[PDB]
From a paper:
Δ9-tetrahydrocannabinol (THC) is the principal psychoactive compound derived from the cannabis plant, Cannabis sativa. CB1 mediates its signaling primarily by Gi/o that inhibits adenylate cyclase which in turn decreases the cellular concentration of cyclic AMP8.
Numerous THC analogs have been published, whereof HU210 is among the most potent tool compounds. Furthermore, we solve the cryo-EM structure of the HU210/CB1/Gi1 signaling complex and leverage this template to obtain consistent ligand binding modes and spatiotemporal interactions through 1,000 ns molecular dynamics (MD) simulations. A stable HU210/CB1/Gi1 complex was formed in cell membranes by binding of the ScFv16 fragment antibody (Fab), and hydrolysis of released GDP nucleotides using Apyrase enzyme. Altogether, the new HU210-bound structure expands our insights into the CB1/Gi1 signaling complex and adds a high-resolution template for THC structure-activity studies.
Author numbering:
A (entry chain B): 2 to 340
B (entry chain R): 100 to 315, 335 to 412
C (entry chain C): 7 to 63
D (entry chain A): 3 to 54, 181 to 354
E (entry chain F): 2 to 122, 135 to 248
Amino acid sequence: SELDQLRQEAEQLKNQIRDARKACADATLSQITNNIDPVGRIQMRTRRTLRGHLAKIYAMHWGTDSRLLVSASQDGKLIIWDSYTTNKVHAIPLRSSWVMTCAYAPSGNYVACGGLDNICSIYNLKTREGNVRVSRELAGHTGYLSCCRFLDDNQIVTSSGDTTCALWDIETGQQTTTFTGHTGDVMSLSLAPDTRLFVSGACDASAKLWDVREGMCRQTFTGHESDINAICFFPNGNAFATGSDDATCRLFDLRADQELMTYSHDNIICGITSVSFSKSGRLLLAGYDDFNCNVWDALKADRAGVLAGHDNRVSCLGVTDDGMAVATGSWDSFLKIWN
Amino acid sequence: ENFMDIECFMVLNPSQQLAIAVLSLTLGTFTVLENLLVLCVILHSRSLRCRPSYHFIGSLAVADLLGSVIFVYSFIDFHVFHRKDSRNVFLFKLGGVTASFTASVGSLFLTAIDRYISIHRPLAYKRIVTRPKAVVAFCLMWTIAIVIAVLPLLGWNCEKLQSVCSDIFPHIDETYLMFWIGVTSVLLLFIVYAYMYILWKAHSHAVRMIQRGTQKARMDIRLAKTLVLILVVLIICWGPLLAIMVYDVFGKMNKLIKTVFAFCSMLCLLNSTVNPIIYALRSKDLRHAFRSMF
Amino acid sequence: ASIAQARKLVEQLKMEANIDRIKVSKAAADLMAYCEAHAKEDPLLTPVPASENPFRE
Amino acid sequence: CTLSAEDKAAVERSKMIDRNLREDGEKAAREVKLLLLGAGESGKSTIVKQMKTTGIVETHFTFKDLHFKMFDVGAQRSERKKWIHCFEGVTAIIFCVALSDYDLVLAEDEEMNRMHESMKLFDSICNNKWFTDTSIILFLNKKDLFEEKIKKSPLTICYPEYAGSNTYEEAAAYIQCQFEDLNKRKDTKEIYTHFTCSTDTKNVQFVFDAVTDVIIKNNLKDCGLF
Amino acid sequence: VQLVESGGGLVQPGGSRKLSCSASGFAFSSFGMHWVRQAPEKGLEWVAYISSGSGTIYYADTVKGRFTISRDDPKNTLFLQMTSLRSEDTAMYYCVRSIYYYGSSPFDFWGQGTTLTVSSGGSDIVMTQATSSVPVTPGESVSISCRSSKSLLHSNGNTYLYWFLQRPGQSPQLLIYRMSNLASGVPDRFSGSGSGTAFTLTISRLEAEDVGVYYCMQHLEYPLTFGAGTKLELK
Ligand SMILES: CCCCCCC(C)(C)c1cc(O)c2c(c1)OC(C)(C)[C@@H]1CC=C(CO)C[C@@H]21
């Protein structure tokens, strides 16, 4: 009785947010982007096939130098590749083979991993000993670790399966702040290019935008009907696309605070495992788990291309910082560098 | 019409040339259709492409296809229209025929040792047979069949070195017959040993499951059915042929034996027709693969 | 302790409700300006030349 | 070639890394990966007591020159849909069922008894899309406590239609047939049912005999013989 | 990270001598090993090289047919079997570790050295240094130029030139690897530049620890040739 009348406020507040949708109901993204020149038919070919894992790859991350790559598979190894050659720069044996995420530092000196072991292990690459050692074990989560992303050598945002995210400190080993408010298990996250905000998505079909210094949710986005498991920012930073299990991608805007465009097709079921943007955000690369990635037009909602070529489902995906190539790693033992 | 390297020996003077023609044409068309079906199902589907035993099934399919087309071309060229050509061309087509029909037995041997080590070393099998090592064994078997095939093209023919010549193969000496019989018999005894050991190990495993409380047989019975089928196909397709080949090198050398040699030489096309239905249709994965493809 | 959680949820939704919202036309114009401002900068739009490509073989 | 000495030594290092990765994969392929699943109260830790925080516990053990890795993942308490596909490719699933909890209920969630929850979990993991062809080593623990409880309380509390007496053997066979009939994939999957006793080297003997059978049958499927 | 050598001393010409370089504090099996000798009042010269896991063994012109280099990875010790020594082998042998991947810093550590003395009885790239002794002053900018007979630029964009500083009484220390990258422990005042065949090493705000001999070494293809040796002296 005491809470229910609060619900009488609260859903009404949501209706006010819906009334805020009437503040931004003048037009859609398709109406503004009419009579524009399309990107056209895209035939980008695989160039490298990074063949050194022996189980299914769950994550990859490019380097900021756009040549190094990192990958984590469901065997106990995490391999750092040269992409120009096909050279394994490193191979790190892991304490637990159940890793679902990995990250590559912008400085390039550290890598991260995590998964069912609830620990974001940080490994120091550049060292005087010559071999990669465990720099810092970041324990403290209770759910399964789902995403990790670096800010610098000391800050890292980890989203786990305990419906919370956390920003940590490498030297202290403890959480600087905890982001709370999702009701389902948190699956993905993405930082802005100016790293002031990051938007993260969970299994409750809600994408929440957080500030790294405030520690609280700024904006909340809804419109999916299944577990959101992929989020990538626009390179401008004022918008972000997401992908979930309903085989639809959605482009939300931070300023409009609503969904702009929906990317879907009639013959596509078996939804998205990973999304990314190209340079200038014109193409949306979505890795669907009917074994292939699709190139959608971010302004025309048209399927420009198909990146089929993986024998199993494209778990992980990523575009280089200069946009030279896109890597897709799948649930066979293989990464592929499409260009 | 005597001994000591006679020519135009072919004994198909009555109307059996029509019967060999219709049987060889039907078996060649059936072999082409079945092996094209197998090669289309295997190559189009990745679920059958990755497994290294289906690479050996495809190797046997390619060997049976090439042997079918080259054998019906050469056999209908020889016993129909009575085309007598030079020694180097007949050696070349006989080399193609024996290359394909040695690679067929080699692919059967590779399949037999694959299934033998899958049940003899159960946990080790996945770390013994892989796709590139199966490709290596495929290439080694095909190249050794090719070099055994081109062995009489260079030196072993009895026209160059004066030795005794076989009558059923006019430009092949009896030494090459003994060598080919030896290699084929060693491969077939290895295949029979592997498919007896699979049945014995599966029977022992089923007995151990019955003695324990682990099971509630059903494994050794099913592979007893398919293994007795495989072995009786192998026996009725390669027993009389090697019996005639032994009798023409270690026997009284009669005249009616050459007539029966062509009709038991079409048993190779019988074997090539029945090989996709006992090595690919016996597979449940390929069965569901061509059920899905329609 | 659902009394404090409901109050925190109401406060969070009220803090998310009173923020400003730019119209769809201005955000779409900004997105189109960013796309066509670096359309030549993206090498995945056009086919890259083989000399400028680092991934050719 | 156009490598020079630095890139030639770099591809030599990558070849050494390839060799070490191949050796590590061959060492890891000698292990048998098992997954412990259950309601939590089934006494599967007692199974850990019979074979011999983080969200996953690995119970490495050996029996007759064969090494088993047993993955207890029931302490995760998250949504099972998003991380059970990590375990697609285990050799078998060891589902543990408390036989003595046929009449015991839990009233915290929805007042229903624990055996219907265990049967719901069995229907969820047996008919999962990832465990289509991974066999289940079903274990029925606490048989003596179940017998001592069915000496007083009959089986009709759990099952509304049980046309049998209070005999331990007939009720155990009925429970085994009820758990086996949740398998909708009986052509591509078997269920290995055992009653957990206090005899040493017998539950691990059942696991070893079940795992050898599924390895033999999976090899016979993979080599085209089935 | 230690590289301690032993077994050196005075030997007869034509005799046999073995040098053992003990490595501790780092992974020995993942590091390619080199031998660099230095005669008194001379420069550095590469002798022999064995890679990680003994995959590749290289020898120089005066080394092939006479020497033998091997490693013991469980023992973490590098060996050097020398047969039929001559008067030109009287040099200070340095045990050098090296690693090779993308972004690595090869020749990053040098041993303390051992003394070998012998009593009395080619399509290569030649490194050119204009002046072997430049008198410098502290607080100014110092420019050191080295040349090569062949262009060190390769198709991958890497220019394989190195800079080594050998302080008196101390092991040589790597300063700049691949002409533009600062090594570990080297301060930010050191910089390098070059274009294909012409090279420029710039030292700004020279201090008391920058005194020593400067060497330029190529790494385009074996055999590895050091520079003549430029020594910077105060006043
Ligand atoms: C010893 C040489 C290898 C044995 C080959 C046995 C098979 C069954 C493959 C065979 C058996 C054969 O009977 C023959 C074969 C091949 O190959 C061709 C070239 C088709 C021959 C053409 C003319 C005649 C003369 O009778 C015989 C034919």
